[PDB]
Design a protein around this ligand. Sequence first.
Ligand code: ADP
Ligand code: ADP
Ligand code: ADX
Ligand code: ADX
Lengths: 193, 193
Amino acid sequence: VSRNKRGQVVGTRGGFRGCTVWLTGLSGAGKTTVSMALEEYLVCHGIPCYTLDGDNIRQGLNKNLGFSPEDREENVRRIAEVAKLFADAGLVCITSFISPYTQDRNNARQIHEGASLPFFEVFVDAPLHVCEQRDVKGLYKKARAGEIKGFTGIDSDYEKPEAPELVLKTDSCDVNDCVQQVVELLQERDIVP
Amino acid sequence: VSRNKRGQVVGTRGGFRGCTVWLTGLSGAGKTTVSMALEEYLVCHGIPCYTLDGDNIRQGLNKNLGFSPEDREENVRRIAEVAKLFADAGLVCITSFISPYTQDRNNARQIHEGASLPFFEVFVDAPLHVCEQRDVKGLYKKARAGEIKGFTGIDSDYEKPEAPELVLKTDSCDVNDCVQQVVELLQERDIVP
Ligand SMILES: Nc1ncnc2c1ncn2[C@@H]1O[C@H](COP(=O)(O)OP(=O)(O)O)[C@@H](O)[C@H]1O
Ligand SMILES: Nc1ncnc2c1ncn2[C@@H]1O[C@H](COP(=O)(O)OP(=O)(O)O)[C@@H](O)[C@H]1O
Ligand SMILES: Nc1ncnc2c1ncn2[C@@H]1O[C@H](COP(=O)(O)OS(=O)(=O)O)[C@@H](O)[C@H]1O
Ligand SMILES: Nc1ncnc2c1ncn2[C@@H]1O[C@H](COP(=O)(O)OS(=O)(=O)O)[C@@H](O)[C@H]1O
């Protein structure tokens, strides 16, 4: 069946709006918080969606991947292909992964734009020194202590987005305020009516 | 957000009905035909769904897998995890893969029933001699000729389902008739109202 027919039966608000909102950023930058609140926002506004994150991907589909650069590349590649299917199905697919390599984020975008599906890269941008100081899950302490090897920002590279569709300054917005900025982008791009 | 809230915004017909319809069977048994017509049927009845098949999975997510037993196991494992996400999102996920190994089909089921998501194994059951004689894509000729190695039914095993939820005798039903049997199962299980 065609995408337009999907858009008729997916959700109450007519129109096909499948797409992928690709969050990227350091550990503790707020990706989980923003993605969960974005999901709540969309559902409350009648827009079916689904979130892919480390919790539901790296314990399942990607349980056989570590954090070597090669495994992060394959992690993101698989996530991009799954997000493309969710977008093709008519859902707003929100992805919440560190995704530290420019090439793999751009490969994820190419998979979508080849299939003529919208792809929005959102750089969840908090300074590393802020993420370390808050250390919301204690991970940065263990990384400095050597108990987690190759942790992004400490012993593994994060390549900052140079051309995201949106930059979220999460040391300066509360959850709902950063969500409002994502909603504005989705309205501009005719995802959210 | 919860599954019940998803069921409110996914589709027009209220109620959460996410699940996976897992087709299994020999090449040429009719999996593609039945899955595509099932998708058409559900969409026409206002039920959002999505089909995973060799066309959209083995050229994308699973492009790095062959047909060794080990690669078929990983192929099915990844597909099962993706189907579980689609079911969790509230969609009827139709899968259309040979899935020749009992253990991997049962592992796929366990992934779903652990997450309390319904899983319906449909054995698309045509005799191998029938599939060979029709040879709808010419594949069986190339398998006998040695141009495709380890082709299911010729140089690779198909373990017949012993406990499917439904057996589809596709040498004896036309497309719509086999679809009607799947619809009956989904009605019995409160997926289709
Ligand atoms: N001053 C603030 N008040 C409320 N929420 C905030 C504030 N600053 C950031 N956030 C939100 O908190 C999450 C993490 O922000 P961060 O500054 O990394 O940690 P923390 O919020 O614990 O200070 C992000 O989703 C962000 O949107
Ligand atoms: N007598 C029939 N008339 C119409 N469709 C059929 C008939 N027998 C099978 N089918 C459908 O054709 C597809 C493949 O059936 P199969 O017998 O393997 O090949 P073929 O249909 O070319 O004879 C299946 O989806 C099945 O539902
Ligand atoms: N070495 C690590 N580097 C970054 N995150 C890690 C590492 N080890 C475990 N984690 C974590 O695994 C999740 C990050 O995974 P991803 O977002 O999937 O990373 S990515 O680089 O491959 O995109 C977080 O739960 C998290 O803190
Ligand atoms: N050696 C093969 N055995 C079975 N199918 C093959 C083989 N090589 C290519 N194909 C095909 O690949 C698809 C079957 O793939 P799957 O359904 O994904 O198989 S499975 O065994 O791993 O579940 C069909 O398009 C098809 O005919």
